[PDB]
Design an enzyme around this catalytic site. Sequence first.
Site, PDB file in Angstrom:
ATOM      1  N   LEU A  22       0.809  -1.225   0.000  1.00  7.83           N
ATOM      2  CA  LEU A  22       0.000   0.000   0.000  1.00  7.83           C
ATOM      3  C   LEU A  22       0.860   1.303   0.000  1.00  7.83           C
ATOM      4  O   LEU A  22       1.975   1.290   0.523  1.00  7.83           O
ATOM      5  CB  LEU A  22      -1.003  -0.027   1.139  1.00  7.83           C
ATOM      6  N   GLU A  30      -9.099   0.512   8.642  1.00  7.87           N
ATOM      7  CA  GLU A  30      -9.435   0.422   7.199  1.00  7.87           C
ATOM      8  C   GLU A  30      -9.381  -1.036   6.738  1.00  7.87           C
ATOM      9  O   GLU A  30     -10.269  -1.472   6.000  1.00  7.87           O
ATOM     10  CB  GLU A  30      -8.552   1.337   6.354  1.00  7.87           C
TER      11      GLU A  30
HETATM   12  N1  LIG Z   1      -5.520   0.133  -2.015  1.00  7.82           N
HETATM   13  C1  LIG Z   1      -6.274  -0.931  -2.464  1.00  7.82           C
HETATM   14  O1  LIG Z   1      -7.472  -0.993  -2.247  1.00  7.82           O
HETATM   15  C2  LIG Z   1      -5.653  -1.985  -3.231  1.00  7.82           C
HETATM   16  C3  LIG Z   1      -4.261  -2.047  -3.408  1.00  7.82           C
HETATM   17  N2  LIG Z   1      -3.647  -3.098  -4.186  1.00  7.82           N
HETATM   18  C4  LIG Z   1      -2.174  -2.920  -4.372  1.00  7.82           C
HETATM   19  O2  LIG Z   1      -2.114  -2.500  -5.747  1.00  7.82           O
HETATM   20  C5  LIG Z   1      -1.182  -3.438  -6.414  1.00  7.82           C
HETATM   21  C6  LIG Z   1      -1.878  -4.615  -7.204  1.00  7.82           C
HETATM   22  O3  LIG Z   1      -1.486  -4.182  -8.468  1.00  7.82           O
HETATM   23  P1  LIG Z   1      -1.865  -4.494  -9.974  1.00  7.82           P
HETATM   24  O4  LIG Z   1      -0.539  -4.347 -10.627  1.00  7.82           O
HETATM   25  O5  LIG Z   1      -3.062  -3.720 -10.502  1.00  7.82           O
HETATM   26  O6  LIG Z   1      -2.042  -6.169  -9.995  1.00  7.82           O
HETATM   27  P2  LIG Z   1      -3.181  -7.248 -10.167  1.00  7.82           P
HETATM   28  O7  LIG Z   1      -3.518  -7.811  -8.790  1.00  7.82           O
HETATM   29  O8  LIG Z   1      -4.331  -6.827 -11.021  1.00  7.82           O
HETATM   30  O9  LIG Z   1      -2.297  -8.336 -10.874  1.00  7.82           O
HETATM   31  C7  LIG Z   1      -1.908  -8.099 -12.256  1.00  7.82           C
HETATM   32  C8  LIG Z   1      -1.785  -9.554 -12.818  1.00  7.82           C
HETATM   33  O10 LIG Z   1      -2.983 -10.374 -12.520  1.00  7.82           O
HETATM   34  C9  LIG Z   1      -3.390 -11.081 -13.725  1.00  7.82           C
HETATM   35  N3  LIG Z   1      -4.647 -10.375 -14.206  1.00  7.82           N
HETATM   36  C10 LIG Z   1      -5.099  -9.109 -14.044  1.00  7.82           C
HETATM   37  N4  LIG Z   1      -6.281  -9.040 -14.682  1.00  7.82           N
HETATM   38  C11 LIG Z   1      -6.553 -10.229 -15.216  1.00  7.82           C
HETATM   39  C12 LIG Z   1      -7.563 -10.675 -15.968  1.00  7.82           C
HETATM   40  N5  LIG Z   1      -8.564  -9.841 -16.253  1.00  7.82           N
HETATM   41  N6  LIG Z   1      -7.585 -11.940 -16.394  1.00  7.82           N
HETATM   42  C13 LIG Z   1      -6.537 -12.842 -16.095  1.00  7.82           C
HETATM   43  N7  LIG Z   1      -5.473 -12.352 -15.351  1.00  7.82           N
HETATM   44  C14 LIG Z   1      -5.521 -11.058 -14.935  1.00  7.82           C
HETATM   45  C15 LIG Z   1      -2.181 -10.969 -14.738  1.00  7.82           C
HETATM   46  O11 LIG Z   1      -1.240 -11.984 -14.366  1.00  7.82           O
HETATM   47  P3  LIG Z   1      -0.671 -12.999 -15.397  1.00  7.82           P
HETATM   48  O12 LIG Z   1       0.544 -12.232 -15.946  1.00  7.82           O
HETATM   49  O13 LIG Z   1      -0.112 -14.261 -14.602  1.00  7.82           O
HETATM   50  O14 LIG Z   1      -1.763 -13.353 -16.420  1.00  7.82           O
HETATM   51  C16 LIG Z   1      -1.570  -9.559 -14.344  1.00  7.82           C
HETATM   52  O15 LIG Z   1      -0.128  -9.503 -14.569  1.00  7.82           O
HETATM   53  C17 LIG Z   1      -0.245  -3.945  -5.313  1.00  7.82           C
HETATM   54  O16 LIG Z   1       0.816  -2.877  -5.015  1.00  7.82           O
HETATM   55  C18 LIG Z   1      -1.253  -4.113  -4.143  1.00  7.82           C
HETATM   56  O17 LIG Z   1      -0.672  -3.824  -2.876  1.00  7.82           O
HETATM   57  C19 LIG Z   1      -4.406  -4.160  -4.808  1.00  7.82           C
HETATM   58  C20 LIG Z   1      -5.804  -4.118  -4.572  1.00  7.82           C
HETATM   59  C21 LIG Z   1      -6.404  -3.064  -3.836  1.00  7.82           C
HETATM   60  C1  LIG Z   2      -6.486  -8.517   5.401  1.00  6.40           C
HETATM   61  O1  LIG Z   2      -5.201  -8.892   4.778  1.00  6.40           O
HETATM   62  C2  LIG Z   2      -5.028  -8.066   3.632  1.00  6.40           C
HETATM   63  C3  LIG Z   2      -3.764  -7.689   3.156  1.00  6.40           C
HETATM   64  C4  LIG Z   2      -3.618  -6.841   2.046  1.00  6.40           C
HETATM   65  C5  LIG Z   2      -4.748  -6.325   1.376  1.00  6.40           C
HETATM   66  S1  LIG Z   2      -4.591  -5.207  -0.053  1.00  6.40           S
HETATM   67  C6  LIG Z   2      -6.192  -4.071   0.237  1.00  6.40           C
HETATM   68  C7  LIG Z   2      -7.203  -4.124  -0.610  1.00  6.40           C
HETATM   69  C8  LIG Z   2      -7.174  -5.056  -1.818  1.00  6.40           C
HETATM   70  C9  LIG Z   2      -8.181  -3.288  -0.293  1.00  6.40           C
HETATM   71  C10 LIG Z   2      -9.363  -3.006  -0.906  1.00  6.40           C
HETATM   72  N1  LIG Z   2      -9.686  -3.695  -2.011  1.00  6.40           N
HETATM   73  N2  LIG Z   2     -10.212  -2.142  -0.368  1.00  6.40           N
HETATM   74  C11 LIG Z   2      -9.865  -1.507   0.768  1.00  6.40           C
HETATM   75  N3  LIG Z   2     -10.756  -0.655   1.188  1.00  6.40           N
HETATM   76  N4  LIG Z   2      -8.669  -1.765   1.388  1.00  6.40           N
HETATM   77  C12 LIG Z   2      -7.810  -2.661   0.840  1.00  6.40           C
HETATM   78  N5  LIG Z   2      -6.562  -3.168   1.175  1.00  6.40           N
HETATM   79  C13 LIG Z   2      -5.829  -2.787   2.275  1.00  6.40           C
HETATM   80  C14 LIG Z   2      -6.015  -6.683   1.808  1.00  6.40           C
HETATM   81  C15 LIG Z   2      -6.128  -7.526   2.918  1.00  6.40           C
END
Ligand SMILES: NC(=O)C1=CN([C@@H]2O[C@H](COP(=O)(O)OP(=O)(O)OC[C@H]3O[C@@H](n4cnc5c(N)ncnc54)[C@H](OP(=O)(O)O)[C@@H]3O)[C@@H](O)[C@H]2O)C=CC1
Ligand SMILES: COc1ccc(Sc2c(C)c3c(N)nc(N)nc3n2C)cc1
EC number: 1.5.1.3
Length: 186
Positions: A22, A30
């Site tokens: 993050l 959160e």
């Molecule tokens: N603040 C938040 O709420 C959230 C934060 N995060 C953070 O953001 C980042 C996650 O990043 P992001 O780069 O977007 O990665 P993703 O989790 O979307 O992973 C990307 C990979 O997943 C696979 N993928 C994605 N979409 C598809 C699809 N539609 N169909 C099949 N495979 C798919 C592909 O892998 P392959 O190459 O093997 O096909 C691609 O390389 C991390 O730094 C994490 O900590 C993640 C979620 C929420």
């Molecule tokens: C509970 O253990 C966990 C470790 C890492 C993450 S990444 C994350 C995600 C994917 C996430 C989300 N989708 N929405 C909100 N509101 N917060 C989030 N976090 C913090 C989510 C859960």
Amino acid sequence: VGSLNCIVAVSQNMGIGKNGDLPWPPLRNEFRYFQRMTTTSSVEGKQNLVIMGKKTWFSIPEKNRPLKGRINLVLSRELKEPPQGAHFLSRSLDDALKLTEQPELANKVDMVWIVGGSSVYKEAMNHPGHLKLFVTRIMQDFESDTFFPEIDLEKYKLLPEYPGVLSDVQEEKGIKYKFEVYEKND
Ligand SMILES: NC(=O)C1=CN([C@@H]2O[C@H](COP(=O)(O)OP(=O)(O)OC[C@H]3O[C@@H](n4cnc5c(N)ncnc54)[C@H](OP(=O)(O)O)[C@@H]3O)[C@@H](O)[C@H]2O)C=CC1
Ligand SMILES: COc1ccc(Sc2c(C)c3c(N)nc(N)nc3n2C)cc1
């Protein structure tokens, strides 16, 4: 199968991740919020499904994988089976959703929660249909290397309240944030 939803926490500059973690320091309430929303199912005897990209999966601490009390599905075209701990593997968002409609999952799944990352969110948000976004607005800029897609407010309505969601400003470790729920239907 009930509702389809996205959940994300984002900074003011639209950042959701940096170097696989993050952009901000851990905000306990959160994470708890995320846990409560994705876990809680209104239909007794069912579970929510969580769908994530591969890099999202590996970002979650090993001890918290799979996300407990939810069915965990990972998206990847490179993997040939679900990661250790994962429940299911699909090669596209379409596929994953197709799967929830198979007889197995059919009557085990309530809500589906897309929990990241950018490209899964993108496809979901721009696909026609009934879709909510649960958005935590981290009220600062933070240096980020992966971004939430644009929210089209012509299509996504910000709801003025939603049961189970606090409206007021939160703060932990000196970072202020708030919860938001958007809905489109198209
Ligand atoms: N603040 C938040 O709420 C959230 C934060 N995060 C953070 O953001 C980042 C996650 O990043 P992001 O780069 O977007 O990665 P993703 O989790 O979307 O992973 C990307 C990979 O997943 C696979 N993928 C994605 N979409 C598809 C699809 N539609 N169909 C099949 N495979 C798919 C592909 O892998 P392959 O190459 O093997 O096909 C691609 O390389 C991390 O730094 C994490 O900590 C993640 C979620 C929420
Ligand atoms: C509970 O253990 C966990 C470790 C890492 C993450 S990444 C994350 C995600 C994917 C996430 C989300 N989708 N929405 C909100 N509101 N917060 C989030 N976090 C913090 C989510 C859960």
